[PDB]
Amino acid sequence: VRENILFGMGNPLLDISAVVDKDFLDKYSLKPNDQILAEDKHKELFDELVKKFKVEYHAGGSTQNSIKVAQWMIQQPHKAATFFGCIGIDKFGEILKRKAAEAHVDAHYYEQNEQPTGTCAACITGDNRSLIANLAAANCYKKEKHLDLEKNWMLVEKARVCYIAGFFLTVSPESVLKVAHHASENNRIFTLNLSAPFISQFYKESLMKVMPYVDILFGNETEAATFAREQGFETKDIKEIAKKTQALPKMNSKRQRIVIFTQGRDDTIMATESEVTAFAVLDQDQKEIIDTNGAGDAFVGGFLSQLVSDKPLTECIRAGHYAASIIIRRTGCTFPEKPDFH
Ligand SMILES: Nc1ncnc2c1ncn2[C@@H]1O[C@H](CO)[C@@H](O)[C@H]1O
Ligand SMILES: Nc1ncnc2c1ncn2[C@@H]1O[C@H](CO)[C@@H](O)[C@H]1O
Ligand SMILES: [Cl-]
Ligand SMILES: [Cl-]
Ligand SMILES: [Mg+2]
Ligand SMILES: [Mg+2]
Ligand SMILES: [Mg+2]
């Protein structure tokens, strides 16, 4: 509808990808398909990747990807979607700012110089992708230094829908809570992503602190299974987990929670107050698949583009499947000049 109607915040990261071999995964004790945070023991990993293999660089970060995709589907006006995050004052940081602008997103960064711009290694093997996030500057986001400044907070107050990936809970749970409480107080929509199994395992306390404020929860089938185990649900059935998650304690009685769990090429599951329904993924051709992680970010971006236009949930799901089908066959969450969705 109008400028700054959709708000997002998270970790701005420059993706570094390359096809590697079994020896490289074994050397760093990497699982073929996984997403983890970079420890001190992984400093060797990033240098060896860039020195032993052919790498490509693409602007990334989960929430940033979803916001760029939402803006793409909205088309007009420019700057309908806002994004906040922290970066370094370097060449990598200039790449991220340049790409956010070309995407027509209203991006406002917290720039500092103690830490370099964050990066994320994507170690590819065939149809598998092992991700390692070295947050660096991204982990320096401080609400008192950015989110709380008058000029920035005003942008959050213009939003009708807010979205933050669960990944940001490892950096600023206080920022996530300030935004979630504001939405609850002003009967606006607050949405969140489970993001990765490690969020439901090691950061479950911050996750459960924010849950009462979550109007719409997104996640894939492995994140749903981990969340169920850690919360003691005692079931591994995706439809039952969606039902129990939907029923969790909620603050704002004016909006019932909606839970959406994707299952790759299998049906997308949606739980509402009254039932649990399934939506087929009609794009079944596997041949040209490239990036399933980015496909999940694009699914959320498509869904959000229709939620701000006030469309039925059926249409939000169709838009999510459409955007995921475009991004899944490309690198760097890129897409054609204009969407073909009416
Ligand atoms: N800890 C993290 N925080 C934010 N984004 C992440 C994290 N780990 C992986 N990603 C992102 O996931 C995206 C693909 O889904 C990549 O662009 C990558 O940068
Ligand atoms: N193997 C796959 N085949 C087809 N579509 C897929 C596949 N994996 C993911 N997707 C699409 O990406 C979305 C997020 O994973 C899915 O709900 C689906 O729309
Ligand atoms: Cl993020
Ligand atoms: Cl997903
Ligand atoms: Mg090992
Ligand atoms: Mg595989
Ligand atoms: Mg995901």
UniProtKB/Swiss-Prot annotation:
<dbReference type="GO" id="GO:0005634">
    <property type="term" value="C:nucleus"/>
</dbReference>
<comment type="subunit">
    <text>Monomer.</text>
</comment>
<keyword id="KW-0660">Purine salvage</keyword>
<dbReference type="InterPro" id="IPR011611">
    <property type="entry name" value="PfkB_dom"/>
</dbReference>
<feature type="active site" description="Proton acceptor">
    <location>
        <position position="297"/>
    </location>
</feature>
<dbReference type="InterPro" id="IPR029056">
    <property type="entry name" value="Ribokinase-like"/>
</dbReference>
<comment type="pathway">
    <text>Purine metabolism; AMP biosynthesis via salvage pathway; AMP from adenosine: step 1/1.</text>
</comment>
<dbReference type="InterPro" id="IPR001805">
    <property type="entry name" value="Adenokinase"/>
</dbReference>
<keyword id="KW-0597">Phosphoprotein</keyword>
<dbReference type="GO" id="GO:0044209">
    <property type="term" value="P:AMP salvage"/>
</dbReference>
<feature type="binding site">
    <location>
        <position position="127"/>
    </location>
    <ligand>
        <name>Mg(2+) 2</name>
    </ligand>
</feature>
<keyword id="KW-0539">Nucleus</keyword>
<keyword id="KW-0479">Metal-binding</keyword>
<dbReference type="GO" id="GO:0004136">
    <property type="term" value="F:deoxyadenosine kinase activity"/>
</dbReference>
<feature type="binding site">
    <location>
        <position position="128"/>
    </location>
    <ligand>
        <name>Mg(2+) 2</name>
    </ligand>
</feature>
<feature type="binding site">
    <location>
        <position position="15"/>
    </location>
    <ligand>
        <name>adenosine</name>
    </ligand>
</feature>
<dbReference type="GO" id="GO:0106383">
    <property type="term" value="P:dAMP salvage"/>
</dbReference>
<dbReference type="GO" id="GO:0005524">
    <property type="term" value="F:ATP binding"/>
</dbReference>
<keyword id="KW-0007">Acetylation</keyword>
<feature type="modified residue" description="Phosphotyrosine">
    <location>
        <position position="57"/>
    </location>
</feature>
<dbReference type="GO" id="GO:0005654">
    <property type="term" value="C:nucleoplasm"/>
</dbReference>
<dbReference type="GO" id="GO:0005886">
    <property type="term" value="C:plasma membrane"/>
</dbReference>
<dbReference type="GO" id="GO:0006166">
    <property type="term" value="P:purine ribonucleoside salvage"/>
</dbReference>
<dbReference type="GO" id="GO:0003723">
    <property type="term" value="F:RNA binding"/>
</dbReference>
<feature type="binding site">
    <location>
        <position position="286"/>
    </location>
    <ligand>
        <name>adenosine</name>
    </ligand>
</feature>
<dbReference type="GO" id="GO:0006144">
    <property type="term" value="P:purine nucleobase metabolic process"/>
</dbReference>
<keyword id="KW-0963">Cytoplasm</keyword>
<keyword id="KW-0460">Magnesium</keyword>
<feature type="binding site">
    <location>
        <position position="29"/>
    </location>
    <ligand>
        <name>Mg(2+) 1</name>
    </ligand>
</feature>
<keyword id="KW-0418">Kinase</keyword>
<dbReference type="GO" id="GO:0004001">
    <property type="term" value="F:adenosine kinase activity"/>
</dbReference>
<comment type="similarity">
    <text>Belongs to the carbohydrate kinase PfkB family.</text>
</comment>
<comment type="function">
    <text>Catalyzes the phosphorylation of the purine nucleoside adenosine at the 5' position in an ATP-dependent manner. Serves as a potential regulator of concentrations of extracellular adenosine and intracellular adenine nucleotides.</text>
</comment>
<dbReference type="GO" id="GO:0006175">
    <property type="term" value="P:dATP biosynthetic process"/>
</dbReference>
<dbReference type="InterPro" id="IPR002173">
    <property type="entry name" value="Carboh/pur_kinase_PfkB_CS"/>
</dbReference>
<dbReference type="GO" id="GO:0009156">
    <property type="term" value="P:ribonucleoside monophosphate biosynthetic process"/>
</dbReference>
<keyword id="KW-0808">Transferase</keyword>
<dbReference type="GO" id="GO:0005829">
    <property type="term" value="C:cytosol"/>
</dbReference>
<keyword id="KW-0547">Nucleotide-binding</keyword>
<keyword id="KW-0225">Disease variant</keyword>
<protein>
    <recommendedName>
        <fullName>Adenosine kinase</fullName>
        <ecNumber>2.7.1.20</ecNumber>
    </recommendedName>
</protein>
<dbReference type="GO" id="GO:0046872">
    <property type="term" value="F:metal ion binding"/>
</dbReference>
